[PDB]
Design a protein around this ligand. Structure first.
Ligand code: ZN
Lengths: 91, 71, 125, 120, 116
RNA sequence: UUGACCUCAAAUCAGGUAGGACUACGCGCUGAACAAUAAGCGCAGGAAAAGAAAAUAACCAUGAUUCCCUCAGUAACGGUGAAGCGGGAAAAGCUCAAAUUUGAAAUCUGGCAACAUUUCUUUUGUUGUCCGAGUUGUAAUUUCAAGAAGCUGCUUUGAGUGUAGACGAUCGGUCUAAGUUCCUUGGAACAGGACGUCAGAGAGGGUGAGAACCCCGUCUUUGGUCGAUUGGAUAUGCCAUAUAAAGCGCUUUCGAAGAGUCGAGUUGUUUGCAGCUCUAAAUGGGUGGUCAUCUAAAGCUAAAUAUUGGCGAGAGACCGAUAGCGAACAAGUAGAGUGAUCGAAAGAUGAAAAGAACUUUGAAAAGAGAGUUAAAUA
RNA sequence: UUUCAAUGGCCCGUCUUGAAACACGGACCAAGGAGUCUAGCAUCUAUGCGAGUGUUUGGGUGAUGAAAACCCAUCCGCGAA
RNA sequence: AGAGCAUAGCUGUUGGGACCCGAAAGAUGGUGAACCAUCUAGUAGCUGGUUC
RNA sequence: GCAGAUCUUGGUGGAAGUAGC
RNA sequence: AAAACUUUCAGCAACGGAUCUCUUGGCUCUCGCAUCGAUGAAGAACGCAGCGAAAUGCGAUACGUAAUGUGAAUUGCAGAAGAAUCAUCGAAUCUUUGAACGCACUGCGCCUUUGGGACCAAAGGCAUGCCUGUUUGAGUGUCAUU
């Protein structure tokens, strides 16, 4: 359509192509080597944080979390830590 | 006769008595790009020439405008 | 089925690629099979055509008749075979063209580059 | 058809010398081609033009490498020795000076930087 | 002037992909920072509880976290909110305390000059 | 006088930077029809603008901005036409002016010298010295969320330079399964029957008709492998100018806060904004309901958002040569117009050119024999 | 099918006018060519649920197109008074 | 001793370029009274046409 | 989904071997 | 009444380019990314091929060179046999013009340097505004100053 687009379509120069489209592939993990090693490359970050014993969001989920299977006087007090529910958190 | 060749635009529209080109508003710096002449822009824009330089920066952006010699 | 978004599945775009390809891309589009005993000798399936390669035509009016490749006519995807000709009006020979995917390569022209190509694709002489 | 790797293995005055006579048969091929030439000569002139380009490329590139060596680690250099990326890049804030931080912000990021925390 | 929502499935996937690169950059820490519990400022919703912007300075000091470090372990600060009711101080201090219960803090190497 | 300091100039004095182009998105000025509308003009970016309350609200109060949904076609106005609320996306906070470092301008550009450093002999720095800038105020310090200063007793710390590996990001090469077996029609088998094979590959295209198995690919690849170029972390070597610098705490000592601005009368523009006339204050000033909230006249700032342009990419219940672009082609091309501008028509021999030798008639043009072809009813 | 024989039948469309008269438009053939797309409202019918009702702003998710499908958190709209 | 809400269709109606074609425009900005380009899908009770 | 719109585009006749040159 | 002429129908040949089939084109939506110019951009003109009609490509290093690859073709011919009307691409080259830059706009110069074989030629630069700095001088300065 445009003149600039059309003169290089008729010309003999090759088009400055870029095979960049990798749909559906997630961002590979860098940073903490422990979680990278235990990071499933196919699962979503909400699934992988849960599988790894980490909270993706400490704040309320604004939606409907997946159901894969049919699942069956204090200001001075301190919360005595939280035991790790997974080995990887213990790592 | 009332128009000669314009040295900047190259189209025979250079008034003698007015000493001004109508096709491109010679000899002023900023050219005559009037919006309502839409068809006039698509006649007189980038890509109607060669863009010999701009076709070099487009290619050189891929590798990051690098320079030097290969090892 | 294609799954990459790097590949395309367009009759318009794939034909644009086929007939808009330059020679260094046309040299792979013009490949040829290898004879069964030679195919297993080098353990490779198909190799690009090359001048002075002994081949046998398998399809067309010139089926069976063997020869070599005098010159590969890349700009129309043809192979020129010696003695596989046609009688023009003036008695001369206008050699017909055969596409590279019809003939079969019987004896390769062993260049130094071809040998590296064979061993590059997990092969051997 | 000469090759460039052996052309770069000599000094300057002979390349200028080898350029000058190569110009000579170029017109001789030109004056013979306008008075009647053959197909072999019609490519020899093409080869001659390409080879004088090879000579010119070799001598010019040695000239530039002479300047870079001469002007290596010099504060200022001629406008053609410098970079040519984009006018915008050459007028940009350098990586170093865009990294500049006030001593207030240096103390902030030293005592209270970001951490690597995690939740269970 | 008309707008079309054809990029609605495109924009949602772009947002999900934008969350995954954030998770990649900051592995152990959650993709979202903690927010406090506050009440909407209207007679219509005042009995509700929702999220706030950040924890006020009385919410940090009472919980036992300085205001400077709070910005670093992911607890956000709101200098504008204040505590007028103690139940608002209570619902957000315990919100901090439960967060610091599950908070693993990675040590950082520190410069140790030979002299002092 | 000398000579300082101030101004005034010049120089091919060194180092620079501005212009024009694009304009889909963006920020301004300005504008008539038929409406911050086209236009006109001005200025930019990969986004622009906006932005950490002189903001709401009357609540159990919320808490930078931006976009989306609702609030809502509602209030108000007189059909025009919102904003809090709420729910989502995203989130990050900050720097100055007003303080005497006064027990020491502690700050900085430029010349020169070496040291380095590189997307890089093309980049970007440091050290040393000299000169300037600067006391009509450059650093540290502090920004109202506070904070300064004295005190206390706990907790803290690099704007270095390598090496090594792991991880990522971008460019490049590379590794990659199986019929062209038999029979029939055809010019051609890619077809029809028969017998098989592969399949993480039966997408698509080519190939002389519909090819998973002849060719390119495709799948494996959400990857092996080899290179380079970088990013944030880890590990560890060396160097640390720390006599230093922070957070929390306690205060018998302190706490600066942006003026031809706000505000008033008045006049234009479209409520704000603009001109003119005047022109302020210090628990003050703005705004809301004697109260609540906020803290203007200085500054920056990511992401969420826009995108009829540019660099590429993937598709489509889209058009199929009077259509779809004005252009499937020599397309803004021929051509028309002094000129600004305007502007078309035009796709298909065949598998292969095998494009019709040759003989003959004709000045030729062409015709008739004749040839090629599956077919010249190509 | 062409033709002939006997009986017949004023040019079509529009507009005009009760009607015509008319005045228009029509040299012929091919192709192109005109209640469409959308927001709002009301009605009738069909379907799902029914004192309820409505997933698609968004989030979760979807390895074989992943712009589809599938799932539900906080509101909200319209009803119910 | 509530009967709606939501989706799809049909017909109707109101806007939107609004079944199609046709009235001098006007305004902005340009070119050498003239002319050009856009705003513009400016305006119609009317005219002609509106397909098995 | 066409027979009309002094409809758009292309093609083609009578007029006509006429006006004529 | 036959011919001629006029008319209908059929055969055949022209004419015309509909229909049908497709299709390196258009349109539409989504997606990724950030990149022009005083280091001369966009645009224009003139050139350039062993021969090009347009058309692209290219700049006196002209349908490009260097470098990295691929490995034998270009193809209407020519043409060489690291070939290639090839790819990649980090090095040089990049005509006259144009914001367009010595004045002018064809010409006319200036300055410096290089040199020729004092003068001339070539090359280099010689556009304005503004910013930081250096040198030079001047003001009717303010002083300073015995
Ligand atoms: Zn001009």
């Amino acid at each position: 359509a445009n003149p600039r687009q059309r003169n290089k379509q008729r010309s003999g120069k090759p088009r400055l192509t870029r095979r960049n489209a990798n749909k559906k592939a997630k961002a590979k993990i860098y940073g903490n080597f422990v979680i990278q090693q235990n990071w499933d490359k196919h699962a979503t970050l909400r699934q992988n944080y849960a599988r790894l014993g980490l909270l993706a969001t400490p704040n309320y989920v604004t939606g409907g979390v997946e159901k894969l299977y049919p699942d069956p006087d204090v200001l001075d007090k301190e919360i005595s830590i939280a035991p790790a529910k997974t080995e990887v958190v213990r790592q | 006769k009332s128009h000669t060749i314009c040295r900047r635009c190259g189209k025979r529209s250079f008034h003698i008595q007015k000493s001004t080109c109508a096709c491109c508003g010679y000899p002023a710096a900023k050219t005559r790009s009037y919006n309502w002449g839409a068809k006039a822009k698509r006649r007189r824009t980038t890509g109607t020439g060669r863009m010999s330089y701009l076709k070099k920066v487009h290619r050189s952006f891929k590798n990051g405008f690098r320079s030097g010699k290969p090892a | 089925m294609k799954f990459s978004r790097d590949v395309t599945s367009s009759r318009r775009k794939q034909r644009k690629a086929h007939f808009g390809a330059p020679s260094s891309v046309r040299r792979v589009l013009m490949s040829a099979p290898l004879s069964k005993e030679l195919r297993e000798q080098y353990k490779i399936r198909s190799l690009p055509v090359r001048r002075d390669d002994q081949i046998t035509v398998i399809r067309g009016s010139n089926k069976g008749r063997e020869g070599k490749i005098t010159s590969v006519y890349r700009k129309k995807f043809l192979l020129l075979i010696e003695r596989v000709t046609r009688e023009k009006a003036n008695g001369a020979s206008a050699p017909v063209g055969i596409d590279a995917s019809k003939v079969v390569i019987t004896k390769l022209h062993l260049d130094k580059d071809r040998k590296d190509l064979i061993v590059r694709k997990g092969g051997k002489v | 058809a000469l090759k460039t790797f052996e052309l770069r293995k000599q000094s300057q005055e002979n390349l200028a010398e080898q350029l000058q006579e190569l110009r000579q048969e170029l017109a001789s091929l030109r004056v013979q081609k306008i008075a009647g030439g053959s197909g072999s000569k019609l490519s020899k002139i093409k080869t001659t033009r390409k080879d004088i380009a090879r000579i010119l490329t070799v001598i010019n590139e040695s000239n530039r490498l002479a300047a870079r060596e001469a002007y290596k680690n010099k504060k200022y250099i001629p406008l053609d020795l410098r970079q040519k990326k984009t006018r915008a890049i050459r007028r940009a804030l350098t990586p170093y000076e865009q990294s500049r931080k006030t001593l207030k912000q240096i103390k902030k990021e030293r005592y209270f930087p970001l951490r690597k925390y995690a939740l269970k | 002037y008309v707008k079309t929502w054809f990029n609605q499935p495109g924009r949602k996937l772009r947002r999900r992909q934008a969350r995954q690169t954030k998770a990649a950059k900051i592995a152990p820490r959650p993709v979202e920072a903690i927010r406090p519990a506050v009440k909407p400022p209207t007679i219509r919703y005042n009995m509700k509880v929702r999220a706030g912007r950040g924890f006020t300075l009385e919410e940090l000091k009472a919980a036992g976290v300085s205001r400077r470090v709070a910005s670093t372990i992911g607890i956000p600060v709101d200098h504008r909110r204040r505590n007028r009711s103690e139940e608002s101080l209570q619902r957000n201090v315990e919100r901090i305390k439960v967060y610091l219960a599950h908070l693993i803090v990675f040590p950082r190497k520190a410069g140790q000059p030979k002299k002092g």
